[PDB]
């Protein structure tokens with residue numbers, strides 16, 4: 001018995017989301033509650049069923065106000081379904097790039113970084129690591145509400161470090177040194193990515209290391225190169241941005257600390 005298992009009939013598929021950049025995800029309707037939802041689907045021919053099922057499973061364990069919420073699943077017979085709440089404003093990257101900056105202001109940017117750090121602190125305590133933390137994987141809802149995508153989560157079964165399947169490709173500009181070097185990800189690797197995410201938020205969606213060819217990024221980081229403080233970015237925040245980019249992962253702060261710092265900046269800023 002699985003309280004989550006539901007009827008594939010209850011849902012009404014509509015169209016694809018994010019132009020496919022997230023896979024087989026569509027906007028749907030849950031007839032019963034006339035609720036608009038998000039539906040991840042698995043195709044006919046795939047060796048994904050194993051992974052697809054684990055994602056769903058993981059999602060039944062996580063519950064945080066800033067992590068996308070699972071509503072139900074259809075995993076008995078194909079096509080498989082993972083049903084989640086619907087985020088009306090898409091991903092945080094597009095949101096920042098199109099938003100009105102008089103509305104989505106400094107306090108708002110601060111507020112969004114707090115929410116994301118809040119979710120990461122939850123994941124950190126829960127012993128999970130996120131394999132793709134970036135603005136493009138943060139969803140936005142009304143009132144600058146931000147939730148981190150639950151897809152791409154791995155649970156640390158033993159160590160505090162997760163090794164990815166040898167020969168896996170990850171976003172260079174968001175990947176911590178140790179990950180690019182040895183395919184090893186810890187929560188500290190997420191801290192690094194979070195620091196990059198901060199940079200995206202502070203630049204209203206600019207591409208990280210703009211103009212710098214990928215083949216050079218790792219070396220530049222070795223030689224101690226880091227992105228400069230974005231125009232308008234308060235020093236306190238850049239200082240935290242820089243701490244997230246310590247070369248040694250153990251020198252990087254914990255999400256508990258980062259969250260704490262933001263909760264404070266956010267609060268004293270709203271005064």
Ligand SMILES: CSc1cccc(Nc2ncc3cc(-c4c(Cl)cccc4Cl)c(=O)n(C)c3n2)c1
Pocket residue numbers: 017018022025026038039040068082083084085086087088089090091094139148149150151
């Ligand atoms: C600009 S319009 C636009 C464009 C893209 C996206 C959205 N909204 C949205 N809302 C909710 C989701 C939920 C998921 C999801 C699912 Cl279906 C299963 C497991 C984990 C996650 Cl995070 C998802 O992948 N995506 C892309 C979602 N997207 C709106």
